[PDB]
């Protein structure tokens, strides 16, 4: 035995740490943790984005169906009278619909203006991507939407989150004009398109066919695959560069292991030049008109 409190206490902390390392505790709502004031949080959410919301509208936005049904479970199981004040809650359904519709419209217009040559199927693909489960959930989670959202099941399953994000968008669209909201969308959505490719989000499976069609439209005829560069054919690691020629002018060119893969690549490149989705392309404009 050694006489003192200090080392004992300090060790109790270690015991706790190991206890948490060996069994991790299931994630808990930030709402159910020691420092919370819902109101102040909302106001902060507003101010930090440099936006102005109606507090009624935003408070409305972070409400979900499931939260209300769970609240009705707690209501009906204890025999309490809630219904008047509880069904006055006005969930986010409406706002979320306005928000998604508007965002899709807005984005679509953005792209349609930036890339005149993108076929409709393509711009549709892009908007589909920036409105995706993944991307929106990511963004919302990092803007502390998951924090404010009222729901059952704390990890907040992704569909509910998407709902909530666009809910907030709609709330903003009511609170300020389509102009301001357009700015918000181009700041927190369009930026997720940074560093991304085209065919990263488009997913089209036969580049050659699509190129032939898009060249019919342009009244150019028959891309001819022609082998340009090659190193080692007999190797386990060959390299081919396939060029695509139109009337003996070279439109585009690409690398690969196999002559097939390379040809396919040159197709993708040509496509990327035609649609004006390119590396060299003008970076997006972030400015105040």
């Amino acid at each position: 035995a050694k006489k003192g409190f200090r080392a004992a206490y300090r060790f109790q902390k270690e015991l706790e740490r190991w206890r948490l390392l060996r069994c991790p505790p299931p994630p808990v709502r930030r709402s159910e943790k020691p420092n919370w004031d819902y109101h102040a949080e909302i106001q902060a959410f507003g101010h930090r984005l440099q936006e102005t919301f109606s507090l009624d509208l935003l408070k409305t936005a972070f409400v979900n169906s499931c939260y209300i049904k769970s609240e009705e479970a707690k209501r009906q199981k204890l025999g309490i009278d809630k219904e008047a004040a509880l069904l006055n809650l006005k969930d986010n359904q409406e706002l979320s619909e306005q928000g998604i519709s508007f965002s899709q419209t807005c984005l679509t217009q953005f792209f349609e203006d930036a890339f005149p040559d993108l076929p409709t199927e393509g711009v549709t693909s892009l908007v589909d991507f920036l409105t995706s489960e993944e991307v929106v959930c990511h963004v919302a989670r990092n803007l502390a939407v998951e924090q404010l959202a009222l729901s059952a099941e704390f990890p907040v399953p992704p569909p509910v989150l998407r709902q909530t994000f666009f809910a907030v968008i709609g709330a903003l669209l009511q609170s300020s004009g389509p102009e301001r909201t357009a700015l918000f969308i181009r700041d927190f959505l369009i930026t997720q398109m940074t560093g991304k490719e085209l065919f990263e989000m488009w997913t089209i499976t036969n580049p050659m066919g699509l190129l032939v069609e898009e060249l019919k439209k342009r009244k150019i005829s028959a891309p001819e695959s022609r082998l340009t560069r090659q190193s080692g054919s007999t190797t386990a690691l060959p390299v081919y560069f396939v060029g695509l020629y139109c009337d003996r002018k070279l439109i585009a060119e690409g690398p690969g292991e196999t002559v097939l893969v390379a040809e396919e690549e040159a197709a993708r490149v040509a496509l990327r030049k035609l649609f004006g989705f390119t590396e060299n392309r003008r970076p997006w404009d972030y400015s105040k008109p």
């Binding site: 420092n35 984005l49 440099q50 963004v139 990092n142 927190f188 940074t194 972030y286």
Partner: peptide, 19 residues
């Protein structure tokens, strides 16, 4: 950066402070 901060607009990343 978190969420391509400062690209579109700058968002102060510090959320809350508890003393």
């Amino acid at each position: 950066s978190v969420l391509h901060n400062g690209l579109g607009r700058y968002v102060q990343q510090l959320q809350r402070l508890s003393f």
